[PDB]
Design a protein around this ligand. Structure first.
Ligand SMILES: CC[C@H]1OC(=O)/C=C/[C@H](C)[C@@H](O[C@@H]2O[C@H](C)C[C@H](N(C)C)[C@H]2O)[C@@H](C)C[C@@H](C)C(=O)/C=C/C=C/[C@@H]1CO[C@@H]1O[C@H](C)[C@@H](O)[C@@H](OC)[C@H]1OC
Ligand code: HEM
Length: 393
């Protein structure tokens, strides 16, 4: 009876056509992913705005059941390991200090990284790899800038987080360094912020409270490794997908070269197109019974939400599986809904905007150095993108 999930696959890039056809020809499925119990899988805009938007669907039971997912280990760390009110106490806090203004006040250093990453490319000669020489190297530097970390240790962090990244190639002898020294260095820096507050993100996170609650050393060390390793994974891979789209679409590479003022509308339309790697948000449980499309959801039963496919619903968007960058204003679902969203987007807006901007400011002659399919791919089993991306100018 159940169907085998994922319907997307680690070797691909768009929303898999059998996924976008079962969103029309079976609009809610029973699924077995590769790890966890059986689940329902929800596909349509107003069904996923519905199941990630009523207070009897929640994450909290995932903490005592083996949860329906695409990878072997359980969700143990960071806010998606957590449930209300205990999640609300954490999210009310991180939204006061992970601000959209501070994201804005990073764009001058993220461009100054970015222009320097194209100056060192230029000085290295061609072909170059644009993931190793750009999409891997823009987050970790901005993200260490955002924490107020000295430049001379951004080298370690690349190599540190890189030995935990699926989008990078460092050995377990560096995980052996990273596990020994990196949590200790952020502790060393968290202790600095307790000692003396400063304009950095860690400082705001020792000063900000939810009502009068304090984010403790372990809580701020946890968030921060997840930012500098998970969020890093996320924006490296999202950038290498996107700038591999700029390498392979020549009419848009000339369109943005022609109209840099259109770049935020293309980022927003590329954002409304995001199939969210595997196609779904992690599993929520109905804590009491609830009917949906004439079939009963049971007390204590898991629903997956296909948010990346529901960002591509033909009955929400025109030709919804494709892009049209002439669409504006725009709105989107490939990041979750109501209290069930990703944290990152105010940062990843500045990355996604800078990362198209200053490439076409600084070396717009750039293109893909190969026959256009002949790359090596990122297979970590939540997100999809290239591992290497050759380029010539
Ligand atoms: C395949 C992509 C993921 O790769 C991974 O999930 C990589 C995980 C590696 C194998 C980590 O191993 C264990 O991961 C568990 C999820 C948590 C566990 N601790 C933290 C409780 C951890 O020991 C190790 C070796 C690396 C450390 C630094 C780690 O926690 C890294 C997480 C990286 C997450 C990557 C990004 O995905 C994030 O996965 C989480 C399970 C989600 O809850 C969400 O996190 C915000 C998702 O974001 C896209
Ligand atoms: C670059 C694009 C990004 C992508 C593709 C991505 C993707 C993911 C996914 C698939 C989830 C789980 C969705 C769910 O089931 O709720 C998630 C949640 C989350 N991500 Fe993102 N993310 C991105 C950027 C960021 C950044 C930059 C950060 C660093 C601050 C971050 C932090 C988180 C956190 C903390 C959660 C849990 C949210 C909560 O439940 O409160 N992400 N991410």
């Amino acid at each position: 009876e159940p169907r085998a999930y994922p319907f997307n696959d680690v070797h691909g890039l768009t929303l898999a056509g059998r996924y976008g056809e079962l969103q029309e020809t079976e609009p809610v499925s029973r699924v077995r992913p590769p790890y966890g119990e059986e689940a329902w899988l929800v596909t349509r805009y107003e069904d996923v705005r519905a199941v990630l938007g009523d207070g009897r669907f929640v994450r909290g039971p995932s903490m005592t059941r083996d949860e329906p997912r695409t990878r072997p280990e359980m969700v143990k760390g960071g806010l998606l390991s957590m449930d209300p009110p205990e999640h609300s106490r954490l999210r009310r806090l991180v939204v006061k200090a992970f601000t959209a203004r501070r994201a804005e006040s990073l764009r001058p250093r993220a461009r100054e990284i970015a222009h320097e990453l194209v100056d060192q490319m230029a000085a290295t000669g061609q072909p170059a790899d644009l993931v190793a020489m750009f999409a891997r190297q823009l987050p970790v530097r901005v993200i260490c800038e955002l924490l107020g970390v000295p430049s001379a240790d951004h080298d370690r962090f690349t190599r540190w987080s890189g030995a935990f990244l699926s989008t990078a190639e460092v050995t377990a002898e560096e995980m052996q360094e990273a596990a020994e020294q990196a949590y200790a260095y952020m502790g060393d820096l968290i202790d600095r912020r307790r000692k003396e507050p400063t304009d950095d993100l860690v400082s705001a996170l020792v000063q900000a409270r939810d009502q009068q609650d304090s984010l403790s050393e372990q809580e701020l060390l946890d968030l921060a490794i997840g930012l500098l390793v998970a969020g890093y994974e996320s924006t490296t891979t999202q950038i290498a997908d996107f700038v591999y789209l700029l390498m392979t679409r020549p009419e848009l590479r000339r369109q943005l070269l022609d109209r840099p003022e259109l770049i935020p509308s293309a980022v927003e339309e590329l954002t409304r197109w995001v199939p969210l790697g595997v196609g779904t948000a992690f599993p929520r449980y109905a804590v009491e019974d609830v009917t949906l499309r004439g079939v009963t959801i049971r007390a204590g039963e898991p629903v997956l939400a296909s948010t990346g496919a529901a960002n591509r619903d033909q009955a929400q968007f025109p030709d919804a599986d494709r892009i049209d960058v002439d669409r504006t204003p725009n709105q989107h679902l490939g990041f979750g809904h109501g209290v069930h969203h990703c944290l990152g987007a105010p940062l990843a807006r500045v990355e996604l905007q800078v990362a198209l901007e200053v490439l076409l400011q600084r070396l717009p002659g750039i293109r893909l150095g190969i026959p256009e399919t002949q790359l090596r791919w990122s297979e970590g089993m939540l997100l999809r993108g290239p591992l290497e991306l050759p380029v010539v100018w």
